[PDB]
Amino acid sequence: NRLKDQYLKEIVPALMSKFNYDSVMEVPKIDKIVINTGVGDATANAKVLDSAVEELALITGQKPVITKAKNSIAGFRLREGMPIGAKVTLRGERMYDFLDKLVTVSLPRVRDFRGVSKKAFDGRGNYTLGVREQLIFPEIDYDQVSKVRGMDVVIVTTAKSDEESHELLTQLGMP
Amino acid sequence: ITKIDKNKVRKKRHARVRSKISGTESRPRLNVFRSNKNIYAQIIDDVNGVTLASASNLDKDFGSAESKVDAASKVGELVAKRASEKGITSVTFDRGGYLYHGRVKALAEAARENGLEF
Amino acid sequence: LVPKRVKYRREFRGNMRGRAKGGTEVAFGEYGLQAVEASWITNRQIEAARIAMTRYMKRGGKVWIKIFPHKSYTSKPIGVRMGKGKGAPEGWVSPVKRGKIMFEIAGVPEDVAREALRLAAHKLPVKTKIVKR
Amino acid sequence: MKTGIHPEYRPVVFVDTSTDFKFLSGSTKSSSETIKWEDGNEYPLLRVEISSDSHPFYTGKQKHATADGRVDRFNKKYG
Amino acid sequence: RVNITLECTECGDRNYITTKNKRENPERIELKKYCPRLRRVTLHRET
Amino acid sequence: SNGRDSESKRLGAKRADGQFVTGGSILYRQRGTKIYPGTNVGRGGDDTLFAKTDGVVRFERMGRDKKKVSVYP
Amino acid sequence: PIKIITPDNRVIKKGNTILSAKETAYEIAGRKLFETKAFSIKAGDKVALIGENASGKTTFLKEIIQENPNLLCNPQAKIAYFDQELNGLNQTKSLLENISEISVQTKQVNREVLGSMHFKESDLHKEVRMLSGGERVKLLLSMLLLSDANFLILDQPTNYLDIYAMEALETLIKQFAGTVLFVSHDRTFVNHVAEQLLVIENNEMNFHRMT
RNA sequence: GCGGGGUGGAGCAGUCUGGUAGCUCGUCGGGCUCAUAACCCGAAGGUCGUAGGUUCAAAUCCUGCCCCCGCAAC
RNA sequence: UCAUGGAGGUAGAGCACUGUUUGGACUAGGGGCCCUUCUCGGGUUACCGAAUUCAGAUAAACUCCGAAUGCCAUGUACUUA
RNA sequence: CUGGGGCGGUCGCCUCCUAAAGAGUAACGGAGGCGCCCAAAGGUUCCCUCAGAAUGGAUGGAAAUCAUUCGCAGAGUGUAAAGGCACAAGGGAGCUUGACUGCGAGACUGACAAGUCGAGCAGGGACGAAAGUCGGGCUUAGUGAUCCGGUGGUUCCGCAUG
RNA sequence: AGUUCGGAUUGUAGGCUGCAACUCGCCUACAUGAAGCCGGAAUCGCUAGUAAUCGUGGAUCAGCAUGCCACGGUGAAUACG
RNA sequence: CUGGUAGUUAUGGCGAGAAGGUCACACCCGUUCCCAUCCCGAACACGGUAGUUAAGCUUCUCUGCGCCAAUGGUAGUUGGGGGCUUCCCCCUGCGAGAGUAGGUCGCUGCCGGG
Ligand SMILES: Nc1ncnc2c1ncn2[C@@H]1O[C@H](COP(=O)(O)OP(=O)(O)OP(=O)(O)O)[C@@H](O)[C@H]1O
Ligand SMILES: [K+]
Ligand SMILES: [Mg+2]
Ligand SMILES: [Mg+2]
Ligand SMILES: [Mg+2]
Ligand SMILES: [Mg+2]
Ligand SMILES: [Mg+2]
Ligand SMILES: [Mg+2]
Ligand SMILES: [Mg+2]
Ligand SMILES: [Mg+2]
Helix, strand or coil, X not given: CHHHHHHHHHHHXXXXXXXXXXXXXXXXXXXXXXXXXXXXXXXXXXXXHHHHHHHHHHHHCCCCEEEECCCCECCCCECXXXXXXEEEEECCHHHHHHHHHHHHHXXXXXXXXXXXXXXXXXXXXXXXXXXXXXXXXXXXXXXXXXXXXXXXXXXXXXXXXXXXXXXXXXXXXXX | XXXXXXXXXXXXXXXXXXXXXXXCCCCCEXXXXXXXXXXXXXXXXXXXXXXXXXXXXXXXXXXXXXXXHHHXXXXXXXXXXXXXXXXXXECEEECECECCCCHHHHHHHHHHHCCCEC | CCCCCCCCCCCCCCCCCCECCCCCCCCCCCEEEEECCCEEEEHHHHHHHHHHHHHHCCCCCEEEECCCCCEEEEECCCCCCCCCCCCEEEXXXXXXXXXXXXXXXXXXXXXHHHHHHHHHXXXXXXXXXXXXX | CCCCCCCCCEEEEEEECCCCEEEXXXXXXXXXXXXXXXXXXXXXXXXXXXXXXXCCCCCCCCCCCCCCCCHHXXXXXXX | CEEEXXXXXXXXXXXXXXXXXXXXXXXXXXXXXXXXXXXXXXEEEEC | CCCCCCCCCCCEECCCCCCEECCCCEEEECCCCCCEECCCEEEXXXXXXXXXXXXXXXXXXXXXXXXXXXXXX | CCCCCCCCCCCCCCCCXXXXXXXXXXXXXXXXXXXXXXXXXXXXXXXXXXXXCCCCHHHHHHHHHHCCCCEEECCCCCEEEECCCCCCXXXXXXXXXXXXXXXXXXXXXXXXXXXHCCCCXXXXXXXXXXXXXXXXXXXXXXXXXXXXXXXXXXXXCCCCCCHHHHHHHHHHHHHCXXXXXXECCCHHHHHHHCCEEEEEECCEEEEECCC
């Protein structure tokens, strides 16, 4: 619990002495992380999920759920009910471990890593990026990846605004 | 995030329950309310709305601390007593929107054990 | 004028009883043409009246056509008996009731306006009068 | 978590082999190595290339300004 | 989609008629249904 | 082209408020629950409201946008 | 009519040595079957393989796919095998399963090839236990064509086929971009199809770039 | 309004039975010939009138429109 | 007939949905003059323009509303057959 | 049948409007559908809730999947439409076969034939702890007389008796 | 064996010539390693030191040849008619 | 007073703002057992009270949205009677919708702890 220890040790006091909260429970936390592939190629081949699911479970440490289409679309040649991509929800020890691994190891492995966009905020106080290419993570080899695809990483927060969210993520080590 | 209200979703379930259960003098409803510290419970008829009998893990009597589950059993036994006193023999169980798994099932089966019939 | 898309092609004739539901009070323009009696008014009549008003105003002013020909009518051809179905649609009409302001003008003086509305009314099967804000 | 469904996930020590930055965190990959870092526990060792401890965006980044391109080359070749 | 008699295994008596899609259900259906001769529930299979 | 209709099904009410009614009687034929079933009243497969005990019909409001019917001896 | 629709797998150069086989006497229970006199097989070759009953043919094909070093198939060859006794199917799976597992290719392409074999929509969920002697052959060949193969190898595909399917297979082997090594006791089929011949006679295997 | 049709440049299939582009003539190129034709050798040229649907996929099954040939009406 | 209680969605009215529609704001996008140019992206055009939104009209097969009458019944009322 | 007959169309069942606020109500009056399907698209028990928009986002775009917010339903309801449904009748999962046998006080409708609803009693079961629900599907179409033959079954008859 | 075949094409760096080598010379080094696994219908030279094959030289010319004209080295098959 | 539990057509709501509390309701802490998730101790479920009133929750304030809401008139209308009859007028009775004055942050009841 490297980063959880770190959190409760340093950042909560620091962050609350900055934003001047009326109590200790107004202080933001990360509720969860949500990883999602977003596969559309699975309309035409079943091997693609067979890759992506195993690959997320290796990247992440728990099985992903294959998400399905809420409605049918002909512009993508997409019938309702088809399996489209998979997702994982990381909470607790494993979201903390995922951020640890992320900033420590994998974010630097990107081609020209000069951080990531600070403007990428939903407006409500949460953050999203996307790993362009899953080989960036160490748990998976490059020699296993038939074809690269990315995945969205949502870092959800109890923060009420972009400022508090950014400071939380800056103290945790997101550039 | 706007987190949930557990009590509100619990009442949404409780309406699924109450669309098929209500209480009458011949056969009241035995409601179970559950909290994290304790359990409350009542026996009431809906035609009138007078809680005929009750019990809880907040009283001055019979207190004990067996991790709240055997306390639930005690509350069951105690409504059974206090209702067989007032003449009640038959009721319909109302799980309050909570599941019939743990503390609630324990309460229920303690009642069924003692002098109370479903 | 026509409606572009219609749900039901064929439609009952209807009534023109009662005063107009609304549109009796000239709102937008300064002057306007009020129907004193009820009648149908066709798209062709509206086009004629509009053009006459606009020519006399010589591309001046702002015109408003309040009415629209929503409803349709049929007519059976000649030499065709009664029955064997309802006829085919021929034309679009507005059932105008009494009190209704069919046309409004802003942007011109009294004389021009009154004379253009006069020129318009003669193209219409309704007895009219002219009325100000 | 269920039984049987998820893959083997265990606490593993990363080490940046650029500067020997040691760091514990959970993962699912041995890299065929084991150490007993943070005395009282065994941990596999998932060695790695550059980490946050050494990446230029987190550290100095002015490096690799080596040549202007064709110009010093011309002037170096012909004086 | 075809109509189907259902006979009892203990009796051989055709206690019921129902239907099935003959592609999605290509086999003799089996279902537990009451046999009034025996006055108990009994397994009936298609004929 | 056109010109076909179906036989009408005699929907609507069949007993009045204040009218004594014997059990099993039909009270309101309908599609869906244009009137919900109430006290001593059922709803059939085709949504018909029928009485279950001998009693006296009463039409009664539920919340604003809905109605029911009950039978009280 | 039937005709087979093949995806453009790989188009390696006509003339590339696909299999070099050096001269070697063979035996399976110790007893000699024949002596190979050495040879090579190039890409685009429609090689027939001829012999009597119990001649060594199926044995030789097993040696190929087991990669005897005396029979060096070059890399990038992508073998694909069809057996006399149809072991290449899984008798448990439905045929959409059996073919969508082994197809490297798109679902649309998988279904196009099945259509070219003239399997109806009703058939896809039938057991392999549930099929005609000809439909099983078509299953393995359709599976072989979905696999990305550049080198088909086919022990007696003429077994349970009708005239339409034999003509369509003739067309297939005769038009096939890659390379192919087939067995058939139909003189008609082998005359219609054979650009090259592998002949087993009097315990002597030989090779001929004839018909 | 009623029938046929609309598929490389022309005439015709293929549609009913969805995966399959075909026959004859022609065109382009190279040969033969002093040159053209004929003949011999190769190759190109069609998203099937069109806009939408259904289907894993449409010349093909469904719908609307636009064109041509006939027959009526006028 | 009087009283009382009820079902019911017509006339009318209304726009709270669905359609039809007028004017204004504003625009995805299409056409052009083009600057250019791997026409990539801009100057953009009132030449149009999906939609979105503000005000105002319309409706047998539209309704947030909604009568009179008529209908069902109850009563011991008051007449009458 | 028929605004003469004929051609063309129609002939039986369901849904709206006409149909005038109970019901019913015609026309060669205006619009559409049916002659099925489903072994789960049924029964129960438990669980939850949609469309669409605003942004944030890697392939990925007007629009696939994801996070947050708004959102009484602007979705879905096997299929036409009307009514109705979010305290489900809409969606998942488990267990199953009540898509049971005998019947049915009483009502609806109604020329007759027929069609419709039905609490409840008994038998023996399914689900659920239980209450209790379940005699097909949110409802309303999905169908056709007798006569004659066929199949299965039966403590029925069997032209003097067997 | 698409191979240590083949040697194109391309990148960088060199050398000569010439006032000058982008358009537009030749040559070198390194790397790249293309097409090509003996050629459709057709069609050409050759009867002896010839054909085939290997190098050499000369002219033109600062430089710029797979072209041209001469040189020798090796050295066949066949001609029924 | 507060925790449950009801009924009442939202005057009862939505939104905004303020005060308070491990007495309760909570949030929170953990997954060691039951049991759990197309993944996930978020939910459910279990075991606990270290921190907090931030939010849910209790109380209070409001008329921004919503909802209700007359009186008067107008429409339409039963019956009767007139005409000039796409329609209209008059007598009597009934009588809207819209809109407006105005109301609304709930109102009653039971049980248990304190
Ligand atoms: N594993 C084995 N063990 C023993 N004998 C074998 C084995 N495999 C094959 N044989 C024998 O080898 C001989 C030829 O075998 P194989 O079946 O390969 O012949 P073939 O020429 O392919 O025949 P066919 O075309 O009739 O199948 C036969 O006598 C056969 O019995
Ligand atoms: K006039
Ligand atoms: Mg039914
Ligand atoms: Mg067979
Ligand atoms: Mg095709
Ligand atoms: Mg009206
Ligand atoms: Mg209307
Ligand atoms: Mg009526
Ligand atoms: Mg006898
Ligand atoms: Mg000679």
